[PDB]
Amino acid sequence: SNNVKPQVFNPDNVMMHEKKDGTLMNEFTTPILQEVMENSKIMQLGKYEPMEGTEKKFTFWADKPGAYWVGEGQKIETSKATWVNATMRAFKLGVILPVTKEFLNYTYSQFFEEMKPMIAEAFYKKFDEAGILNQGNNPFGKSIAQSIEKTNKVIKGDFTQDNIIDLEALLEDDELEANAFISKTQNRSLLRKIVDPETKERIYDRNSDSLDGLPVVNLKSSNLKRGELITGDFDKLIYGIPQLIEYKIDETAQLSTVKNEDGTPVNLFEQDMVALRATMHVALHIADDKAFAKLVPA
């Protein structure tokens, strides 16, 4: 055949040094990273939990003994203690980047080195959107949005000192105290104009990003609408990481989610390609479904 035109791939996920129009991509100006890579908001707010295996067990007290008033010589009565159990399991993230070795030699010598933070960003975002908002095919049967939905612990209405204090009060109604707020940066516009009419104190520090003195955390996700605000006792949100991000780079495997122009699976050895695999194990547990409340626009 001696077919020298470059290989077409489906999906077009393969990086290449040569374009199908014949353009050859020497002298490539390495792109500069505009933004700052985002942290995991769950890893910021939640409580870490050591976890050796892919599963973890918790046990807590539930019932405590009583007491009785007894006359002299009277029979002292019995009482009983009781406990309850809970458990959490991990799930695996991952992605693969395939690269043509010509590309890795004559175009972007550092490409895999430049992707590792962008992968860590995409993994942290996937985790946050799964656990907080129950979005992105949440693997856990657990999430903040889902706990709020099952408890119906939702306030309807506009951002007001009235509603935000009612929102926090909704937690001590269950003998829990609020610890932080989760919000969409689009809405600090609204928070930056609600003021207490007696004291003329503003409920929001524009300077410290504190709302009623509690710390505010911003989600970059597009799922949380402007008018929505979330609060809870985040010490009741437990997370674990059995396997921190593991990268591995392989020169001889077969890919199968990518096909050659003729439909054959991509063989990295035979086709002279290299591919970078990244994976991570992450586990999430809501210790108390009642510890979270949400404010939504009516």
Partner: protein
């Protein structure tokens, strides 16, 4: 409780594993010392530090 020794002083913190070992400053959070190098010394049983 964490003590961090540097060439000019000791920093002191509190941590717990639950919060992810976020080092929080403490009462008398820093304490100067008059040496000019880190005070802790390590001895090794052999090149590999094996027992």
């Amino acid at each position: 409780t964490v003590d961090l020794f540097t060439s000019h002083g000791v920093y002191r913190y509190l941590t717990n594993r639950t919060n992810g070992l976020k080092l929080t400053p403490r009462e008398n959070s820093f304490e100067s010392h008059s040496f000019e190098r880190m005070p802790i010394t390590e001895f090794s049983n052999n090149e590999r530090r094996k027992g």
